[PDB]
Symmetry: D2
Subunit: 263 residues, 4 copies
């Protein structure tokens, strides 16, 4: 309860996942009160390595549930200082030519619209709790991806929606600056969320990770969570509309397979 | 019928608008056969400065109509070489805090999903007409905005959807490269579409155009259309996944109001 | 046709190289008067597939020679409308740790400072010849690289100098807009300049070209030259401070080696 | 608390300036041993709000002095874990057309080449001290600017050199990943370094800060220093080749002067 986020009230969505779980834990460790949101069965199966998380189920596909769960969360926290919008469908479908309406809609509705609705409700609660008055500020952090800027193959709906989130983040930063809410995105590269170092073990994918990531491995959840603490703390008071990219150099490098040690 | 696009079959959406009309005209002038798509009443009121456009009505909010109009267009052209996806709702709503579900949905459904559906159908027609076989290639050009990368105030749905289109464009470039379809975006800055130099005449907006656009004026439709010809022609055979930005230096400059001549 | 650069006076540096030679030829083809600049021995061994080039030797490492050669060029052309700054040392040195003062200096002095000096002279000549008066405009086009934004391994001086040129391009665009000079960069990806399809034939490099370039091949000089014509023509009158990227999708894609057809 | 940089050996250049001083102090506060480098007279007039800084004079224009001062620093620290390359000439000259060889050279030589030379020495020392062996890693952090990506008017040499540093940062990240050195840039927007809130008080500049920065004010040094601690700590172990942008939303927003509250 001492810590870099001492006394802050935080909601983390996608909180049963690798990045969300690590963020919930880092946040509790840094003294925040934390509501953990995810799908009901996923929350039911998750136990945090730190105690005190308040689990509240919230299906991002259900618009009424997003509002209800956000109001419930805010009532229980007594306010809202920090929102980490990390809930998302992951992965690919196949070639763009074969991408169905159903899959397009699921990724856009859950990942893009779900983020918008969560963040609009969070932003309104922050303002209602005093953000932008008496020197009080608040924090919205979206979880995007390197896919917000450059495209993986065979995932056009996921990639499109990550671009949607990138620019939603900047629109929110611009409109909410006057309300004392700072809004930024975290863009993770490949992150192993298995707990087992098995997420990227398929040989071809394993070789590609060695060639395309400068550090030559997938990331760990904690390596992303640390940026969620950084963006949320009071000291980040001039950082808004930005992305912190956490990808072992993937997006910084070309012809990584030609480098000494790999070629 | 001689010209840099001689013998090409092209569909332009948003073809009643400033940029779409200029593109239809440039394309006819460069020898392409051109289907012009837009809302029925908007097409009915538009006469092109060049003859030979084939008007086909297509409401982007109607998913079945997108497919039907695309098949009708392709049948009449006898194939498909070029698609310019320019149909879009423009402009703002107000602050992000007050942005309604209805307005979010309209911008995402028309501008982002409408572009996806048009482009998926176009891409499938290109392939069916021989793209990626016997040295035959095709061209998909999306009309985005400087808002695909940096946010205007009070337009979070429009801006989000432009980011969606930015990354859709790159996903399409990656998945369709093997099918000989090159996919790029055009990112216009402020473009006066009134025909009257009245689009940016409001004093405060007029002052901002002088300060934030290096060239110190809004663009004209023809200045955007010329890039649609460039991307569509055979010579652009190594350009894919890119954006051509046409904004008088807006996105290249900071503190433009401090420059000599303005300060 | 009427040439798209009919009557224009152009200087192209790096004119003995692949991209420069292709640009000189495209420009003569489109009706421009062209001065071709490169190192003396390189000019002496180059014959253009189009006639009329005025060869003028100019070593980028010799500052006095940059000014003298520019004044001579401008006197012979009777003015200056277009400058393509393409002269550059290419390629790598080894790891950053072992990069010598001498190599650093050679890349920075030739590729960055050489570009600055050529462009400052050119810009001054353009203004002296009437740019920015009576509706007259001019064009400065820099040849950068995908290395202007993302780094290849083992070429830190080349990559740094390309970033230098990227931001010099934007500075110039901002400062010269009031003088009617539009300034843009071309960012080529891998381009085979051998004439032989042997530039990227080394097996590991060949495999990386297939995995990292969406189009799965190196570019050809003409595929870059076409953008130089596009940027230089009167129609591109609202394009400044921008980059046209010509890289087969390299900079738009991640995990290209995982795509169907490659994995 | 335990300091987040407990036991780490750091060098901070530009340490008499606003950002450097704030970084030296944050670093001492977080338990690092710190060598503070700047010009001799500037060091001599600086007293830190935290004790323990080791002041070592180092003129970035003198290449032999860069090596000697780095070797002395490393001998005194007994190694090197963190380098913050913040030393730089600031500000403008006038229009690109009038930019002299002397000014160009001063900005490039000090800000770009000075950074390269400091970082190459630092990187070598880090490797000699055990970086990349036995799980040991190190950190190079460059201080760039929003001018690394978008140009201010009338400062072409400063802006170019900032682009240089942006891409040097990525080159270093790629080449040094195998040596366990993570390399990132901090891109500050306008930062008031007067201590007095007088840096941006000139009326036209003040109005532009309100219109172009979402937060509507200049930053403070501590708001940049906090990112230097974040990047340097062990937790940031998957962040390399990236930029953290600290600019109140400047680079994320267009037509900021049109937003409600400003228009
Ligand atoms: O890597 P990473 O940690 O981001 O990926 P991940 O898959 O580990 O985490 C994404 C999180 O988003 C959640 N999610 C997916 N669909 C949802 C929905 N419809 N409503 C609420 N949450 C949903 C998942 O349950 C998951 O916990
Ligand atoms: O500048 P600019 O020229 O791009 O802007 P614009 O408004 O001039 O053009 C956008 C075009 O998109 C069209 N459009 C809007 N909604 C549509 C829909 N639901 N279905 C089909 N077309 C639609 C508009 O009619 C318009 O012609
Ligand atoms: O085509 P591409 O750019 O991809 O590669 P390239 O190597 O084929 O072209 C680069 C051109 O720049 C020229 N150049 C290098 N140093 C020079 C100097 N110091 N002075 C004048 N010209 C110089 C080279 O001769 C070469 O012709
Ligand atoms: O903080 P901020 O960076 O925004 O601005 P700033 O001007 O306050 O800091 C820049 C620092 O870099 C230092 N510097 C400039 N030239 C130098 C040189 N040649 N050798 C060593 N140090 C030099 C300056 O003294 C200054 O302390």
């Amino acid at each position: 309860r001492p810590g870099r986020l001492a006394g802050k009230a935080a909601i983390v969505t996608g909180a049963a996942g690798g990045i969300g779980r690590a963020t919930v834990e880092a946040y509790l460790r840094e003294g925040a009160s934390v509501v953990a949101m995810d799908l009901a069965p996923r929350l039911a199966a998750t136990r945090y390595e730190e105690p005190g998380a308040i689990p509240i189920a919230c299906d991002l596909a259900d618009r009424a549930a997003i509002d209800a769960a956000m109001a419930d969360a805010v009532a229980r926290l007594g306010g809202l200082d920090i929102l980490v919008a990390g809930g998302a469908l992951k992965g690919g479908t196949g070639n763009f030519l074969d991408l169905s309406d159903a899959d397009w809609d699921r990724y856009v509705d859950v990942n893009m619209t779900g983020t918008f609705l969560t963040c609009r409700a969070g932003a309104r609660a922050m303002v209602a709790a005093g953000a932008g008055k008496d020197g009080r500020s608040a924090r919205i952090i979206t979880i995007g991806s390197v896919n917000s800027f450059m495209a993986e193959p065979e995932a056009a709906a996921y990639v499109a929606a990550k671009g949607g989130v990138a620019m939603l983040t900047r629109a929110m930063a611009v409109d909410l600056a006057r309300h004392g809410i700072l809004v930024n995105m975290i863009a993770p590269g490949p992150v192993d969320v298995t707990g087992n170092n098995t997420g990227y073990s398929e040989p071809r994918l394993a070789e590609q990770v060695l060639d395309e990531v400068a550090l030559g491995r997938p990331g760990l959840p904690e390596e992303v969570a640390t940026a969620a603490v950084f963006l949320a703390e009071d000291g980040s008071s001039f950082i808004t509309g930005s992305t912190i990219t956490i990808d072992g150099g993937l997006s910084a490098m070309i012809f990584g397979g030609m480098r000494e040690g790999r070629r």
